[PDB]
Design a protein around this nucleic acid. Sequence first.
DNA 1: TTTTTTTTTTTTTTTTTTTTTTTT
Lengths: 309, 309, 309, 309, 309, 309
Amino acid sequence: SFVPIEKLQVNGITMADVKKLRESGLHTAEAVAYAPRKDLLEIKGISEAKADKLLNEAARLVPMGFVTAADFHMRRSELICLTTGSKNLDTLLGGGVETGSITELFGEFRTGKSQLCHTLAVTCQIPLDIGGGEGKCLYIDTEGTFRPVRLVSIAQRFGLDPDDALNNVAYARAYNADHQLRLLDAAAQMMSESRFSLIVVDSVMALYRTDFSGRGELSARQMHLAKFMRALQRLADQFGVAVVVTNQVVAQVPKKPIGGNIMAHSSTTRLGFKKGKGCQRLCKVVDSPCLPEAECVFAIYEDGVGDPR
Amino acid sequence: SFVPIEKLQVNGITMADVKKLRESGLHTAEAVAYAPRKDLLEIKGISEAKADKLLNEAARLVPMGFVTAADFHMRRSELICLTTGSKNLDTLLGGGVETGSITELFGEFRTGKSQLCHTLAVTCQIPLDIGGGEGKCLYIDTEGTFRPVRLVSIAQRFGLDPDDALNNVAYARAYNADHQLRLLDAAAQMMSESRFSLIVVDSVMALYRTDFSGRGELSARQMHLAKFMRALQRLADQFGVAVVVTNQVVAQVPKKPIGGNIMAHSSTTRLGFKKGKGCQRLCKVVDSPCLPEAECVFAIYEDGVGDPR
Amino acid sequence: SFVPIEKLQVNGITMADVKKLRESGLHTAEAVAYAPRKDLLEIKGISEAKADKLLNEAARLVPMGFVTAADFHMRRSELICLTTGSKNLDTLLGGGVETGSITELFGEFRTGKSQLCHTLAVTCQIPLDIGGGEGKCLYIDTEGTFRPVRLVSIAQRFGLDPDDALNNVAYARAYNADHQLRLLDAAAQMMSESRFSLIVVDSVMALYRTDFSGRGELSARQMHLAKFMRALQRLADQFGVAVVVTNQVVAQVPKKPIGGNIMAHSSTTRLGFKKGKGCQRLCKVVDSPCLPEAECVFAIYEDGVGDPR
Amino acid sequence: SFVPIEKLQVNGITMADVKKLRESGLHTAEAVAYAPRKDLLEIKGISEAKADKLLNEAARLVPMGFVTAADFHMRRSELICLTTGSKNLDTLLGGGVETGSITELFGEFRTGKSQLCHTLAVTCQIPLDIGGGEGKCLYIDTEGTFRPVRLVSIAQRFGLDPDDALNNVAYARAYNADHQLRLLDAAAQMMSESRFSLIVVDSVMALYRTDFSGRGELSARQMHLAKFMRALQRLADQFGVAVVVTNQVVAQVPKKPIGGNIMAHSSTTRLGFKKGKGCQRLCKVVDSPCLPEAECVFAIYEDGVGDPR
Amino acid sequence: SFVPIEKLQVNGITMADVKKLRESGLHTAEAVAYAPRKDLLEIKGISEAKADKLLNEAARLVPMGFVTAADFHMRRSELICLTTGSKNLDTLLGGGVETGSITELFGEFRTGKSQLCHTLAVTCQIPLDIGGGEGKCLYIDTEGTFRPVRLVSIAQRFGLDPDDALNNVAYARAYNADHQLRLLDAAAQMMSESRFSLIVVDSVMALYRTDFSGRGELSARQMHLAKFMRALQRLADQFGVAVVVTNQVVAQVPKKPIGGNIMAHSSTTRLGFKKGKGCQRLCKVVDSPCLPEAECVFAIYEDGVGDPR
Amino acid sequence: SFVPIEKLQVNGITMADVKKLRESGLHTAEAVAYAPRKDLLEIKGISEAKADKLLNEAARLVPMGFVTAADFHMRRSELICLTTGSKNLDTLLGGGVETGSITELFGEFRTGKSQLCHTLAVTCQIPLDIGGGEGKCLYIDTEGTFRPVRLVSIAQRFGLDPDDALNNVAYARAYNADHQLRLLDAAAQMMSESRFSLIVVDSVMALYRTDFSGRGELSARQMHLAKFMRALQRLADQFGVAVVVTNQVVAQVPKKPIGGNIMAHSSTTRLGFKKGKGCQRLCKVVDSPCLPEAECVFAIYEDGVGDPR
DNA sequence: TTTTTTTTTTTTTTTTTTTTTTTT
Ligand SMILES: Nc1ncnc2c1ncn2[C@@H]1O[C@H](COP(=O)(O)OP(=O)(O)O)[C@@H](O)[C@H]1O
Ligand SMILES: Nc1ncnc2c1ncn2[C@@H]1O[C@H](COP(=O)(O)OP(=O)(O)O)[C@@H](O)[C@H]1O
Ligand SMILES: Nc1ncnc2c1ncn2[C@@H]1O[C@H](COP(=O)(O)OP(=O)(O)O)[C@@H](O)[C@H]1O
Ligand SMILES: Nc1ncnc2c1ncn2[C@@H]1O[C@H](COP(=O)(O)OP(=O)(O)O)[C@@H](O)[C@H]1O
Ligand SMILES: Nc1ncnc2c1ncn2[C@@H]1O[C@H](COP(=O)(O)OP(=O)(O)O)[C@@H](O)[C@H]1O
Ligand SMILES: Nc1ncnc2c1ncn2[C@@H]1O[C@H](COP(=O)(O)OP(=O)(O)O)[C@@H](O)[C@H]1O
Ligand SMILES: [Mg+2]
Ligand SMILES: [Mg+2]
Ligand SMILES: [Mg+2]
Ligand SMILES: [Mg+2]
Ligand SMILES: [Mg+2]
Ligand SMILES: [Mg+2]
């Protein structure tokens, strides 16, 4: 899928240089190709001359030019989608959650945002012919609501062994925004050794709310958030995984999501959740580059997300 | 349990540094590990190149990284749950009140919110064999309804010596929101010396209602409340105690709890109380990450909360 | 349309000099005539007494002097306008999108900026008698929202063949600001071999946000952006194409476009988009040298941009 | 109103010397009278002795000495002023735009700088008894915003014939700063053959911004600009025309014009524009040798600049 | 006042010698006394053994030797001082502008430098009792900002007849630096026939900026400027008049006057002007041999320079 | 302190020879003894015989031979040292300005060079017990900055009577370089009839710059300057007075004094001035035969040079 | 064989928050 970063060791580029690059956070040749020159010179040990040759070798292995739209159409026809467990939602989304972009879920409390993430963390492991991804899951939790018992219950409905299902999920907790950003380097390091398919951030704005307080700290908060979103997009470009994030709401003094224009402009797809009758929930498509606006109904059960019975 | 803060005395850090840190409000190595760097560059005497040292230390002692979900599942099966005195309530809660998270109780007047807190203040001192926690209780009051004469009667039912029961509860009264926030530092200091198991806040919104008035002060109220909730969650993370808070209701213009979206998103479990016939009452699960919705019946007697006769 | 650069090989200029000029990014005689002397001296091979000869010959081939306003009036009556697919919008613009200048579209999320670009990428290929351009399209994407499926649906409505329509669009993705500026040399190389009529940049400011962070890098950011805008205008002068760019908005601490005074002064026409009822949207003329301020309504359908139904 | 340069061949000077002078860029006897000797001894062919004869002969035809202030008052009380189409503006300026000096207009985008230039290009042709000039216009454009449709619309309001109006304006487009300076020699050549009354430069600093970049090229940029301003003032002295230039603004890191101290000291009159309500605009006098500070209001209509209802 | 030159005609000196001296710019006996023998021998028709007697004579008429400081104090106590029209300014300067020395004013655009010169050109004619000088004014303008209209208004405020005020000012315009130096011979010739009391040079540095461009011509520029300043001082010594000159500023790449050390060392008094609130301006003493540093406030009105209110 | 020239009257010598020598400019036997025989030849009236006799005489009256270093060391102990009015300066200079040598001060404009000379002109009359010289002062001015009011103010601070203080200073003004050289003969004649202690030249290079312009005339300027400095040193040797001179600076294309190597080698002590905060100034030792290189601080007040508070 | 001089010039915006309270 990607080009190993060891193939950049020619014409006087040694292994110590590659070790310095890995210590900086780059783990593939694509990561080197996508970075600007001013970024590479902020590493203690990389002189101006090398920074040029490094950029010349990477471009020979990673294509960056012009193609026709027919070629891009053919390539895009081969991306896989992940099933949500509900037929209504799969039809509404055009197949499921798609790899290579960012999907956002928002709503008020107990509307079902964490249950769907739990369901996807299982369906990302199953065979491709039933809507799976045949990969692993990386889960980052900023609120403390992750529950392995739900995973154990869900894995039985899809014919899995609970031991392997629990072994194939990597989990981490974050305590402030700097730690939240720091964890992405470890994620990138782990992604280059085995095959993953999904990343979850639940939720993305909870710690920013209190780490920066009031007017007078707004600009710095928005700048930090923009850096985080750019890093997530770069990971999706490098490894071809799906990315899912959650968000909270506030009242207009009737409810709207938080994070402002930075949040609104950088998400590929946006979905809104609402509370229904009993165990039923309502879903609406709020933003998309290729889908119309519409609505549907789903339900929460002991074994996960499904269709109303 | 935790790691003493005195272990951050390896290199270039003197007892004066730890004294300054303890002045700032930190009494554990976890507290230093969980704080952002921008927060450390605010204590007179710590400037730079030292905050970066205290951060490198306490990460070797306190883990912050990825694990498997099977390890997390094994660790979570060791948490303690405290009995409520009623079989139906314990069955509905999946065991009782669980350490490490936040539970909220809401309802209209004389629905039984304070009697349950009084009963929990006793059940947390008894041995783990019968559903206790073998620890002390910290009780903060903002309405003036704490009555030590109920504790004597309740303790006489569980085979406790009344004088020991009364000596093992710490009590404080608050007069405004700033005082309420300030008491938490003293709580942390006390918890770093002896062993505690439970914390009660009764009630959390009573003083906010009158300290801030009108739409022109609404934004400043919610930020203060968010800071308070974050501090409570940090204490629960540090010491592994249970946290219980109470809340009032209002009319729509049929009744809903006060506090807005900050309150609704920051709580882990939510329970609603209603009035029944005679001494009986009804309880309902309104929000939870691993339990379905259901209801049961309990009763109030001269010896505490129990099952209907 | 343009004078080929091979006509400059006279009176001592050989093929090696033209090869060096081409490698430096010049592909037409007009490009040589528009460059200052200080620019030519910075190319290896051109020393002196040769740049002067090149400039004299280019001025002989390309006119740069005074004419009467009647001649310019006659010449400007032969410019082509491209239809947007909506009659209200075409009337509001005096005919459509005009070749030889720069048009800017700004608004908040999901207001319809990318859908109009997709529609224009098809209408630039149809015959002149129905508002087409009879040429090819070049598309540069910095956000990853280009979707070939919309082109098939839009091409079906205008009587085009989908395979031919997909073969006549050239597509490229950019990953940082240096790469974005670099792609224009390849664009200029491609335009001198076959006929194009439209260029799209979607969007112009997305990567500048994160590549330059905070105050202290603001001047360098603005200077880089000024260079990019000047290159776009030079391409429009050289080849007689239409240029369309998109832009994001920010809050005033009620919304305004980003990019400052450089962006405000560099654009020829400026249009603002707003969200309406259902699938309807509103457009407003914010700046123009020959049109008054006015407003209209348009709509988004499965087959593109059109009039309300 | 000027002495032809053919009067200098009296005793010892021939037609070849005058041809050399004309090729170097001198077209009147006043031009020879105002040039320093070091400049004359720089044309191929002209040596000493001859360079000493011309300088003497010119002094006999162009007076350079002391006079009384009463005589200067009498002469200055016979200068033409050009109407702007608005009565408020004419009152604020003391009659209109003054021949023999330099006027500068600055402001942010779409504040009306180019519309007033378009109106003046028409009013410079009408008879003297209604505020006109009975002359021709020369227009230099560095941004590409010149539109003859506005001229056709404006000429009808004043009773002119549109074909005559279009035949009496000379137009040129500049592509870099060297070309911009080079066009003034052709301007002088043209002005020595027919009667003109106005010159427009719109705008003056647009190409300097990008032709020189950064700290290391600031001195050369300012020196080039000083030469351009001196040449403009020389033309105004030579032929008795009015000179109008436009300028852009930047933010103070609330807005100020660009060009430094050279521009600020070189202009005779300075006016600032601001955006009002609907089609209304505000004008302020920022610098002048004989007028106090004050403000007024004007408006833009389909037929040019006028009074607010 | 001064000793006429005709008195030199003794001991075999004819009128032809005196005419030859007058043709070279010498118009008094003090001028011949102040000149060195080397300069004298550069005149055609005056050779050795003639300069010997020319220098021997004029030493009996003009004294050049030693005296006591008390006598010089007595002589200096009889120097006229002109009034600026403002009491704060007259107090800050010790009485007004002093005859026999050089005063320089510097500042940025529209700080009031030319208005004060216009006011002095009137106050130099009023009787000695009210602070005048009872003489004529000589005015040299290099920028083109002289306005006789202000003189009428200013004269109406001091009880003067406007026509006589306008007839008592001599005005000249300079077109390059050689012409600027040439005009001083005519000034000296005029001053030997009628009584003058003030000389004005408005922007002594404006033409030097462009006449010598860039490094490589700096030495010649400074040498020419030094000659001009020396001639000004000689005139002030010869006729006992006051001398006022103006100057521009540049940015320190927070502003400083131009001209270098040659200008800084040859000015007796230096004053800096700054912009205030409304029509108010601030003045500061920057250099002087007998005054301390201080500040004051003045204002500009339709009748000239005056007190803040 | 000197042998009168009238003491050289012996056999073969008459009054006419002494009168002729006095006319030439020799006033003491030391001057005749120090004059090489070649010099005593252009004096019309003395060719041979007389010159040899005069040289033989004054050898017995003035010692010309070898002495022990101890005798010279003892004789050097009877040297006066004038106070500068500042304690820091007196400490840095080792006591004050010393008689018998040459001191030079240099710096930029308004650095305090003339104020110190004014103060010395007064302190040179104070009694020896408090650092005086009990003599008169000779002042030569080439710029026109001498102000007796400062002397009157300074006299009171030291207990002197201003009427008497003004009568003990001789003042002269120089108009060109030849006159500047000529004044020294009169100075020497004056010093042979009364007791003087100080001599001041302010400044020494102001007229040389303009009397000799540019290259080609160089080295004649330098020969003239060398002669002037040799004459100054001869006076200092003859009469045992202190000598002080001033100097200007130029920029290096950070500033350096003017005069070349002649001035650099001829001076005995060199001091540099710099501007400080408020009325404070900084002094630096740049050259001295027997002193280290240190710094100091002083200030200027209404009564002269003093300590920085 | 000889003997140093003399300063200049401004640039360029960013970025949302947060519910209240029964009546006959
Ligand atoms: N085992 C279970 N069986 C049925 N419903 C459950 C179970 N666990 C949780 N739920 C339901 O899921 C809801 C919580 O949804 P969640 O995704 O945690 O909300 P949020 O949108 O805040 O993330 C609760 O209303 C609860 O009733
Ligand atoms: N000793 C007691 N015996 C029986 N019932 C009691 C006793 N003390 C209080 N109660 C009951 O408890 C109720 C008070 O409930 P409480 O928890 O204080 O209400 P809230 O929900 O406002 O906190 C009263 O209705 C009262 O009847
Ligand atoms: N196939 C389709 N049919 C109908 N509407 C669509 C279709 N695809 C996208 N849309 C609508 O277009 C809108 C997105 O507009 P777009 O131009 O991508 O926004 P932006 O202004 O951010 O570029 C969405 O609201 C979506 O509902
Ligand atoms: N034909 C017209 N009728 C009415 N208003 C017009 C017409 N043409 C242009 N305008 C108005 O003039 C303004 C453009 O001002 P302009 O002078 O070009 O700006 P700038 O100050 O940038 O030069 C626009 O806001 C536009 O609405
Ligand atoms: N008749 C007048 N009445 C009031 N103020 C005037 C008049 N004429 C000129 N001014 C003011 O004088 C100022 C110009 O000052 P000036 O001395 O010309 O500046 P500079 O320092 O550039 O020479 C302007 O700001 C203007 O407002
Ligand atoms: N009477 C006074 N009171 C206070 N300060 C004065 C007085 N006279 C002159 N000065 C200060 O002395 C300084 C002039 O120093 P001076 O020695 O003349 O400079 P230079 O080094 O050019 O000769 C000025 O800055 C001035 O402020
Ligand atoms: Mg939630
Ligand atoms: Mg209650
Ligand atoms: Mg968008
Ligand atoms: Mg504009
Ligand atoms: Mg000015
Ligand atoms: Mg000085």
